[PDB]
Amino acid sequence: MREIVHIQAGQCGNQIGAKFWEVISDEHGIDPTGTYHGDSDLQLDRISVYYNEATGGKYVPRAILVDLEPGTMDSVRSGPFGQIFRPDNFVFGQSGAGNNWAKGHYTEGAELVDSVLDVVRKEAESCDCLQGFQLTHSLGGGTGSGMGTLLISKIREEYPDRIMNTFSVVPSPKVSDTVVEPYNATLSVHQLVENTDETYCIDNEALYDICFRTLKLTTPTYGDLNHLVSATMSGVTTCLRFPGQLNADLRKLAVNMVPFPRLHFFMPGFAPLTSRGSQQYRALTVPELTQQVFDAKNMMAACDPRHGRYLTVAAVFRGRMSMKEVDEQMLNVQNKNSSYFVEWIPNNVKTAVCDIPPRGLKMAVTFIGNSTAIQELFKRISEQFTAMFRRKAFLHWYTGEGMDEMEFTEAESNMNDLVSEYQQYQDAT
Amino acid sequence: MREIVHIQAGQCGNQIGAKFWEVISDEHGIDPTGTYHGDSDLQLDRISVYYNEATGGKYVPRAILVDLEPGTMDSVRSGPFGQIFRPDNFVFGQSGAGNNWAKGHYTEGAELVDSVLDVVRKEAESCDCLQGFQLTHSLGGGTGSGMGTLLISKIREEYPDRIMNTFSVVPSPKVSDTVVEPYNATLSVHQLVENTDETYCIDNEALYDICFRTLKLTTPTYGDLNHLVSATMSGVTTCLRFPGQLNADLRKLAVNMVPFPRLHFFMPGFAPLTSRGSQQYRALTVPELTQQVFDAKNMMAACDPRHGRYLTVAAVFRGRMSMKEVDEQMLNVQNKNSSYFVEWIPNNVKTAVCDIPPRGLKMAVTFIGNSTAIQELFKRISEQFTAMFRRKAFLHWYTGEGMDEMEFTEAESNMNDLVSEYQQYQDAT
Amino acid sequence: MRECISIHVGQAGVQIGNACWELYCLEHGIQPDGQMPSGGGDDSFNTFFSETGAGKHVPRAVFVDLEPTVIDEVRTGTYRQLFHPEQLITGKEDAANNYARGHYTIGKEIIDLVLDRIRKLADQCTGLQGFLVFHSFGGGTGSGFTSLLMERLSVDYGKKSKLEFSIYPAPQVSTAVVEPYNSILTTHTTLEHSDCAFMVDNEAIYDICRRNLDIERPTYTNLNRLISQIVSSITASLRFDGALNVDLTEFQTNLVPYPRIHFPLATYAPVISAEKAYHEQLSVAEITNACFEPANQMVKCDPRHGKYMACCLLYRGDVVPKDVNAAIATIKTKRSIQFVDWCPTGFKVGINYQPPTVVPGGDLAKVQRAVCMLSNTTAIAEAWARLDHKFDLMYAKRAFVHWYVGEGMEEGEFSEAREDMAALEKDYEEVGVDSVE
Amino acid sequence: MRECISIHVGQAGVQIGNACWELYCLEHGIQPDGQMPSGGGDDSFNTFFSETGAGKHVPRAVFVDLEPTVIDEVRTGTYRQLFHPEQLITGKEDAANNYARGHYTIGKEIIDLVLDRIRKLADQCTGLQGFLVFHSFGGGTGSGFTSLLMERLSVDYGKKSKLEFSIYPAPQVSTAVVEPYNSILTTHTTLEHSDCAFMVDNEAIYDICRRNLDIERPTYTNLNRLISQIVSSITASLRFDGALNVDLTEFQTNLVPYPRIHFPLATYAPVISAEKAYHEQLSVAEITNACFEPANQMVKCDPRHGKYMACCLLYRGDVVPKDVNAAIATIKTKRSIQFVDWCPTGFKVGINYQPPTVVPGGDLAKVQRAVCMLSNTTAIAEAWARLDHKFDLMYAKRAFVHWYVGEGMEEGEFSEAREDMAALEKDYEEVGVDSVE
Ligand SMILES: Nc1nc2c(ncn2[C@@H]2O[C@H](COP(=O)(O)CP(=O)(O)OP(=O)(O)O)[C@@H](O)[C@H]2O)c(=O)[nH]1
Ligand SMILES: Nc1nc2c(ncn2[C@@H]2O[C@H](COP(=O)(O)CP(=O)(O)OP(=O)(O)O)[C@@H](O)[C@H]2O)c(=O)[nH]1
Ligand SMILES: Nc1nc2c(ncn2[C@@H]2O[C@H](COP(=O)(O)OP(=O)(O)OP(=O)(O)O)[C@@H](O)[C@H]2O)c(=O)[nH]1
Ligand SMILES: Nc1nc2c(ncn2[C@@H]2O[C@H](COP(=O)(O)OP(=O)(O)OP(=O)(O)O)[C@@H](O)[C@H]2O)c(=O)[nH]1
Ligand SMILES: [Mg+2]
Ligand SMILES: [Mg+2]
Ligand SMILES: [Mg+2]
Ligand SMILES: [Mg+2]
């Protein structure tokens, strides 16, 4: 019951999905071959949430992999948990679309999205009681943005009454890798806000900063960043999979986090994150975790919450902790941060508790924050977009493959409307 | 010959009746099995007053046990004398009636009253020459007060010329164990004043006070209180059972004690009563008995006789004594306490002497008093009733069963008329 | 020949009857089962006892009570074999100290059977002389049933005399709240139908027992024994021979000067303890002097207040006529005893040979001489006035009238009885007030 | 005979029901397997348990949750043998803290099955006399589904009484954002349908466990154990013999003055740790005084600010009537504890002989006496005012209304619920005013 279909798009989405499935397969005690070798019945009681059961005890992930070029998929096939996936779910193109949103969406996207919807439908009818979908993609690229937005739109057409969660790697002005990131992000935000119920913004600058200052990694590679994202991905879905004293599924989280329908863009976080060297000299307790999650340097979106206000907050604890401690720490935090928390919501915090800690972590907590500080990223992207769009010289690539400039203006207007709504509720009193 | 039919209603009435039958069986020499093992022919001479004879010498009480809740019936059947009673004389329902006079009188009691009257008619037509009835009930409850009043009214319809005696536990302002006692007592008094010849008011407060100051019981329970009440009940009915120099029939007592037809609310008492240590040092003669009974603190209801005046007094002596001593002592009491006796009766005192004393005592005496001090209990009950009824405190429970406020006002008016008559004859000169 | 019929009603009457028949059995030597193994004894039993072929002697007595307790006591008692079963009559429930209940509603069932039993006894008798009735005014059964039975017997045997021995309520001592109502109700019937009624007060016998027998707390047994002694002294003239015998009719003719004035007072002497009997010689003169004192009268009133109209002395034992003639002369000389001027000779004497009988284990000492005086005087009007006050004081508020009204009695009967007692008191004070030639 | 059906809805309800049925099994000596190797035990289980032919004892209970995880935890836990498989009812998706989702859309599928199971249990019952319902106001399931079930059961069994034991949001401690909306939507059906609702607060029990038992961090298990002790105290009068027994109808008649005033506070004593139990005496007067302290009220309200209107004292263990009467007299003469003028006698006493049972691995100390004190008072208006303030602050902006109207309701429901709670608090403060004459 309450199964989830996982979809991967683009190189970044594919790598994050690979680490995600590695973490969850280790969590449920499944080998790369798919054989179960766990030690507790709780792992096997609700294995159906993510994995389909094949004959002979082999477990197939309910995963869809999508990319417009085959090299990333060959790498995933050759990966440590590459054999575990279903070969039929590998839907590939022949050219990686460059970085062109129009190429990713219309021309190359139209051919492959039919097959992608076919495999998604095949998994969906196989599901007994489908809860929702999961999507991993990067807004900066062309393939990820176009294919993810088109697929999100068509899946929302097909299954309007099902929750959709996206984990989007937003661009930043410091770690920019390509020139067309403002165009791709601007084109993607409209479909994201329109056709999604939950959107978790991730930023590469924030994960790099966390890896440097918190974990003291000398040469942080993409694998560490993807593992940090996968920690939160495993954290949000723990209540569906394992028992606990306070259960919070995706719909419970959405009802607690979204006051108004367009305010579903959240800021993730995770604790305890400590370096191997310093972890000996620290006591792991609920107050320490509660302070660490609310620390602004622990946020994974490259925003400053002191520049804004929190509408609502959610904390999904994992472990055998007692809950008046959680309530006392949450009430204390709400008392101290009362300038930051909006006055029109009396209680801004949603608590959940699960009894099973994650891999090698006696305690864990996953932080989700709906705050008005998220508008800074959209402001930066809009500023870069306007700076590049004042000159029409670069738009000929997008004009090719059939797009027009009215789409660009409409997308900019929609992002302006979104940040206007966030600022309006910041200024509400 | 000259039979009495004994009836028990409610928990309090059932417990007092159990203690009463224990005392009577001890007096007549009857085992719990029912076989006679006495030591004198006088016990068998008028065993027919309270018992019917079976084939093999087994004597069954002429008792009727009634209660809407069967827990009290199970307790009585499991008691020390539970084997003695007739199984057919246990009439019970399936719900304890709450503490609702309306529920006890109208809804629940209507079903059981037919069976109760059937058993009463069976026992009464079994009697050679019926003299009267006896009924034990508590006025504060629902089942006791309501169904006892209903049964008394229907028995008065069926047998208008016979005597009907009641021993009623009145509510008190210091041992109040139930919220709605004033409503039940007020509604019960209107039926009690009309449909009974003699009623004996009892107070748990006065019984506890007797147990504490006189008997010096450290932790008195309901058993001792019921034992005192049973001692009075056995005392009043001695002249019918045993010989004596002067015999007081129940009709003789009623004629002596009741000047006017509505003044039949008596205050009982018993003597001698002493602690085990004091019994040794005590001298036991008629002057001591007379002084003890005429002491106010020995009275069975929480009232001072000093406030009012004695309309009439009856003294049933038991044992062997010279009745000249009785006459001269009781004349001395009348002379030295003249102000407490009404002028419009020359001799306020009735005397009776029975030869057989109770259970090893050299002598004993039972005191009955018709006095104007009884109005205080009705005054306080009326005050509580008015205080509750001003705001319509709990009337929806009664009107749900079917009662009307007009009946409440009529009951209050009737109690007001009763205390008005008592105050009138107090003020008469 | 020369027999009387005895009737006992109520608890007081029945208990006094047990005492009396014990005394008669002792006097005639009749053992309690009725046999008589043992020359006045060869004829004295015929007065009170009837004989059968087996040598058994049965009392000429009837015992009636509307409640069964006392009759069951005598049925189980020592004298169970003495009395014939049909003589003992039982109702089913007492009158509850209610005159109306005793007379109207409950007495009707039993009165016919009682009259049939009396009729059978009277048919057995030949030369019948009287009717002795024992009851108490204070009781309900006593008052009502005695009223009913006396009216019925006056209808049936009006040509024969009837004697009464009744217990009267004391001025202070009492054992029932509604004694005045019953007493004033039954005074009319006893006044109309009784030929001579003797009055008794329990408090007076208590005082006499205290003073003359040293009993600190006597009981009804002693008082009933004294009553038995007085009635036996009255009947000894018929039962035994004597130098100067008096019959009941001649006694009534001597003692009763007017028709309605027939309520004499009775006294007995010498009443003495066995401790003090040895000290005093107990002569005829001192016996006569002691018999006239106020303190020995058995109705609590002083004869010094009233005036003596007629006196009847009944001596039994060794007595000579000189001694009694001298004694009555000495008593006439004393001025404390004020006799009415219109009566020149106020004394009638009777003498009997047999001494008084002493019961076994009794308090009274054996004595070879005894006297019983029956004296008509105006002093009893004081007791009647006290009782009338006690009645009207509570009747003014209608204290207990509804109990009597429920049993069919009318409210006018109380007023009629009060008017009758007022008339009797006025007659008693009128006859003795004065006279002029 | 005298049965009661228990209903447990939502995570809070079922998790309390686990402790409740553990306590009942221990008290009646029933193993979790269901066998009773072990005369009050001969029928005391009949109130809560049903005996099959093979000697197994089945709970009279229904467990419902739209989320299957907690019910599956019960199915996998120790008590899998005890419960009937069908009575453990499960959905497929949780209500997600949404009243409209719990009440309208998801509840309609499973409410018919729940009603069929309750119908079967009621048919098996012969003297049924009440319903026990356990739920939380904050949860979407525990609000909407229990509102639906309450109104359906009120339609079906309108004569029979209904008892709720509800968890209320605390003043400050809260685990969800839409608790005011869910609770305010629950209260209309709670007021209209249920006959008595017992309010409980997590923060108050946390403070009680911190102060009394000296447990530094309390957990849900101790809260559920305390609530289990409360309900066991309420039902012990039915289940066991006593000197003064109080059934549910008697209790409601005593404690409920007016139809809309049926929201008592509940307290237990002696709530004490094993270390302090050895030093303290814990006698009748001590526990009675401890019951009225503001610390032990179990809901974060000051009894001083309100006035008591009716109190019920359910004693269990070795108790005598004298002691409780003296304690009640002491409490009445005390003036910090103020009762309304129109209730001269505000105390209803019940006693039973079964002392409390201590669960293995518990925190409550074994004690030979215990008292459960329930009280109707006006202090709960403060908690209602706090929740209404939170509701007004959230609803002024229409914060989360889009989720609720998505699942099939209108803003008229919110407005009507707020108006109904306004009226209820107006009535509760209305009855506390002194009489005018
Ligand atoms: N956190 C991570 N970011 C990654 C990873 N790989 C790439 N990226 C970043 O994500 C952004 C998008 O790059 P991708 O190659 O994934 C773009 P996509 O394949 O969706 O579009 P095309 O360029 O049309 O193929 C870009 O800034 C990359 O530097 C990765 O493993 N982790
Ligand atoms: N003297 C005694 N009083 C008792 C006894 N048992 C109860 N009571 C008193 O009686 C009063 C209540 O009367 P009951 O409990 O018998 C009420 P009843 O059964 O007649 O009606 P329901 O309330 O409808 O069951 C209350 O004051 C008790 O303290 C007892 O054994 N002795
Ligand atoms: N001298 C004497 N008087 C007695 C005796 N027994 C009863 N009395 C008197 O009788 C009075 C009471 O009336 P009772 O004659 O006993 O009444 P009853 O004839 O039985 O008629 P009820 O009242 O219906 O029972 C008391 O005041 C006593 O003075 C007795 O044995 N000797
Ligand atoms: N005292 C106590 N409270 C509990 C317990 N479990 C949950 N709660 C309370 O229940 C409230 C939320 O309601 P739930 O019962 O969990 O919700 P639900 O009935 O399962 O319905 P959903 O909201 O859809 O999950 C929380 O605020 C908790 O305080 C428990 O075991 N003991
Ligand atoms: Mg790519
Ligand atoms: Mg009862
Ligand atoms: Mg008599
Ligand atoms: Mg739930």
CSV table of C-alpha atoms in Angstrom, one decimal, chain A residues 77-269:
chain,number,residue,atom,x,y,z
A,77,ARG,CA,24.4,-0.1,-15.8
A,78,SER,CA,28.1,-0.5,-14.9
A,79,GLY,CA,27.6,1.0,-11.4
A,80,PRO,CA,27.7,-0.9,-8.1
A,81,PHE,CA,23.9,-1.3,-8.1
A,82,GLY,CA,23.5,-1.2,-11.9
A,83,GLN,CA,22.4,-4.8,-12.3
A,84,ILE,CA,19.5,-4.4,-9.9
A,85,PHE,CA,17.4,-2.2,-12.2
A,86,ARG,CA,14.9,-3.5,-14.8
A,87,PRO,CA,16.4,-3.4,-18.3
A,88,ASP,CA,13.0,-2.5,-19.8
A,89,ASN,CA,12.9,0.8,-17.8
A,90,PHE,CA,16.0,2.2,-19.5
A,91,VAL,CA,14.5,4.6,-22.1
A,92,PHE,CA,17.2,6.5,-24.0
A,93,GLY,CA,17.6,8.8,-26.9
A,94,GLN,CA,20.6,9.4,-29.3
A,95,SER,CA,21.7,13.0,-28.7
A,96,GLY,CA,21.8,14.8,-25.4
A,97,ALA,CA,20.1,18.0,-26.5
A,98,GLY,CA,23.1,20.2,-25.8
A,99,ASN,CA,21.7,22.6,-23.1
A,100,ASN,CA,18.7,23.7,-25.1
A,101,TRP,CA,15.3,23.8,-23.3
A,102,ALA,CA,13.4,23.9,-26.7
A,103,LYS,CA,15.3,20.8,-27.9
A,104,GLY,CA,14.7,19.0,-24.6
A,105,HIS,CA,11.0,19.8,-24.4
A,106,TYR,CA,9.5,19.9,-27.9
A,107,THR,CA,11.5,18.2,-30.7
A,108,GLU,CA,13.5,15.5,-28.9
A,109,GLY,CA,11.1,15.3,-26.0
A,110,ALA,CA,8.0,14.5,-28.1
A,111,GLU,CA,9.4,11.2,-29.5
A,112,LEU,CA,10.7,9.8,-26.2
A,113,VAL,CA,8.0,11.0,-23.8
A,114,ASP,CA,5.5,8.5,-25.2
A,115,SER,CA,7.7,5.5,-24.3
A,116,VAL,CA,8.5,7.1,-20.9
A,117,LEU,CA,4.8,7.4,-20.3
A,118,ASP,CA,4.3,3.8,-21.4
A,119,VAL,CA,6.8,2.4,-18.9
A,120,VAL,CA,5.4,4.7,-16.2
A,121,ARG,CA,1.9,3.4,-16.9
A,122,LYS,CA,3.2,-0.2,-16.8
A,123,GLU,CA,4.6,0.4,-13.3
A,124,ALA,CA,1.5,2.4,-12.3
A,125,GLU,CA,-1.0,-0.4,-13.0
A,126,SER,CA,1.3,-2.9,-11.3
A,127,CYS,CA,1.1,-0.7,-8.2
A,128,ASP,CA,-1.7,-1.8,-5.8
A,129,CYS,CA,-2.3,1.6,-4.2
A,130,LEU,CA,-0.2,4.3,-5.7
A,131,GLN,CA,0.5,7.3,-3.5
A,132,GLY,CA,2.6,9.5,-5.7
A,133,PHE,CA,5.6,10.1,-7.9
A,134,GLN,CA,9.2,11.3,-7.4
A,135,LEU,CA,11.4,13.1,-9.9
A,136,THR,CA,15.1,14.0,-9.9
A,137,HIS,CA,16.3,16.6,-12.4
A,138,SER,CA,18.4,19.8,-12.8
A,139,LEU,CA,16.7,23.0,-13.9
A,140,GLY,CA,20.0,24.4,-15.3
A,141,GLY,CA,20.2,21.8,-18.1
A,142,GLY,CA,18.1,21.4,-21.3
A,143,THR,CA,17.4,17.7,-21.2
A,144,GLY,CA,16.4,17.7,-17.5
A,145,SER,CA,14.3,20.8,-17.6
A,146,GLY,CA,12.4,20.1,-20.8
A,147,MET,CA,11.8,16.4,-20.3
A,148,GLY,CA,10.9,16.8,-16.6
A,149,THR,CA,8.5,19.6,-17.2
A,150,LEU,CA,6.8,17.8,-20.2
A,151,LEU,CA,6.6,14.5,-18.2
A,152,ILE,CA,5.3,16.3,-15.1
A,153,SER,CA,2.6,18.0,-17.2
A,154,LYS,CA,1.5,14.7,-18.9
A,155,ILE,CA,1.6,12.7,-15.7
A,156,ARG,CA,-0.5,15.4,-14.0
A,157,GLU,CA,-2.9,15.1,-16.9
A,158,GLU,CA,-3.0,11.3,-16.4
A,159,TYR,CA,-3.2,11.1,-12.6
A,160,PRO,CA,-4.6,14.5,-11.3
A,161,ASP,CA,-5.4,13.2,-7.8
A,162,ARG,CA,-1.9,11.9,-6.9
A,163,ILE,CA,0.9,13.8,-5.1
A,164,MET,CA,4.0,14.7,-7.1
A,165,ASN,CA,7.4,15.5,-5.4
A,166,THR,CA,10.3,17.1,-7.3
A,167,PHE,CA,13.9,17.5,-6.0
A,168,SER,CA,15.2,20.2,-8.3
A,169,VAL,CA,18.9,21.3,-8.4
A,170,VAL,CA,18.4,25.1,-8.9
A,171,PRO,CA,21.2,27.2,-10.4
A,172,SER,CA,23.4,29.5,-8.3
A,173,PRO,CA,25.4,32.6,-9.3
A,174,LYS,CA,28.7,31.0,-8.0
A,175,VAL,CA,28.8,27.4,-9.3
A,176,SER,CA,27.4,28.2,-12.7
A,177,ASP,CA,28.7,25.7,-15.3
A,178,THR,CA,26.8,26.7,-18.5
A,179,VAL,CA,25.6,30.0,-20.0
A,180,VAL,CA,21.9,29.1,-20.6
A,181,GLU,CA,21.1,28.2,-17.0
A,182,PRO,CA,19.0,31.4,-16.5
A,183,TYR,CA,16.9,30.6,-19.6
A,184,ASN,CA,16.4,26.9,-18.7
A,185,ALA,CA,15.5,27.7,-15.0
A,186,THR,CA,13.2,30.5,-16.1
A,187,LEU,CA,11.4,28.3,-18.6
A,188,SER,CA,11.1,25.4,-16.0
A,189,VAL,CA,9.8,27.4,-13.0
A,190,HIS,CA,6.4,28.0,-14.5
A,191,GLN,CA,5.7,24.3,-15.2
A,192,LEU,CA,7.2,23.4,-11.8
A,193,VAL,CA,4.8,25.8,-9.8
A,194,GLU,CA,1.8,24.9,-12.0
A,195,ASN,CA,2.1,21.1,-12.1
A,196,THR,CA,3.7,20.0,-8.8
A,197,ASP,CA,2.5,19.6,-5.2
A,198,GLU,CA,5.9,19.5,-3.5
A,199,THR,CA,9.2,21.0,-4.8
A,200,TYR,CA,12.4,20.7,-2.8
A,201,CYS,CA,15.1,23.2,-4.0
A,202,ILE,CA,18.7,22.0,-3.8
A,203,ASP,CA,21.7,24.2,-4.5
A,204,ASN,CA,25.2,23.0,-5.4
A,205,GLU,CA,26.8,25.9,-3.6
A,206,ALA,CA,25.1,24.9,-0.4
A,207,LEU,CA,26.1,21.3,-0.6
A,208,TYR,CA,29.7,22.4,-1.3
A,209,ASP,CA,29.7,24.8,1.6
A,210,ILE,CA,28.3,22.1,3.9
A,211,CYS,CA,30.9,19.6,2.7
A,212,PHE,CA,33.7,22.1,3.3
A,213,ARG,CA,32.8,23.7,6.6
A,214,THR,CA,30.8,21.0,8.3
A,215,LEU,CA,32.2,17.7,7.1
A,216,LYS,CA,35.8,19.0,6.4
A,217,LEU,CA,36.0,17.2,3.0
A,218,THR,CA,39.2,18.3,1.3
A,219,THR,CA,38.1,17.4,-2.3
A,220,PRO,CA,34.3,17.0,-2.3
A,221,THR,CA,33.2,15.2,-5.4
A,222,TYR,CA,29.6,14.9,-6.9
A,223,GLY,CA,29.2,11.6,-5.1
A,224,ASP,CA,29.3,13.2,-1.6
A,225,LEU,CA,26.8,15.8,-2.7
A,226,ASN,CA,24.4,13.2,-4.1
A,227,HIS,CA,24.8,11.2,-1.0
A,228,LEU,CA,23.8,14.2,1.1
A,229,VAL,CA,20.7,14.7,-1.1
A,230,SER,CA,19.9,11.0,-0.8
A,231,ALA,CA,20.0,11.2,3.0
A,232,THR,CA,17.0,13.7,2.9
A,233,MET,CA,15.3,11.5,0.2
A,234,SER,CA,15.4,8.5,2.5
A,235,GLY,CA,14.4,10.7,5.4
A,236,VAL,CA,11.2,12.1,4.0
A,237,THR,CA,9.7,8.7,3.2
A,238,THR,CA,10.6,6.8,6.4
A,239,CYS,CA,7.2,7.0,8.0
A,240,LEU,CA,5.6,5.1,5.1
A,241,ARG,CA,8.2,2.3,5.3
A,242,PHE,CA,8.7,1.8,9.1
A,243,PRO,CA,6.5,2.1,12.2
A,244,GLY,CA,6.7,5.1,14.6
A,245,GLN,CA,5.0,6.9,17.4
A,246,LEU,CA,3.9,9.8,15.0
A,247,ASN,CA,3.4,8.9,11.3
A,248,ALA,CA,3.6,11.6,8.6
A,249,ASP,CA,3.1,10.5,5.1
A,250,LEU,CA,3.4,12.7,2.0
A,251,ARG,CA,-0.2,13.9,2.1
A,252,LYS,CA,0.1,14.7,5.8
A,253,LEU,CA,3.3,16.6,5.1
A,254,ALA,CA,1.6,18.5,2.3
A,255,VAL,CA,-1.4,19.4,4.3
A,256,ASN,CA,0.9,20.7,7.1
A,257,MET,CA,3.3,22.6,4.8
A,258,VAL,CA,1.1,24.3,2.1
A,259,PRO,CA,-1.2,27.1,3.4
A,260,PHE,CA,-1.9,28.5,-0.1
A,261,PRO,CA,-1.6,26.3,-3.2
A,262,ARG,CA,1.3,28.0,-4.9
A,263,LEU,CA,3.6,28.0,-1.8
A,264,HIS,CA,5.0,24.5,-2.1
A,265,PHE,CA,8.7,25.4,-2.6
A,266,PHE,CA,10.6,24.1,0.4
A,267,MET,CA,14.2,24.1,1.8
A,268,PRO,CA,15.5,20.7,3.0
A,269,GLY,CA,18.0,20.0,5.7
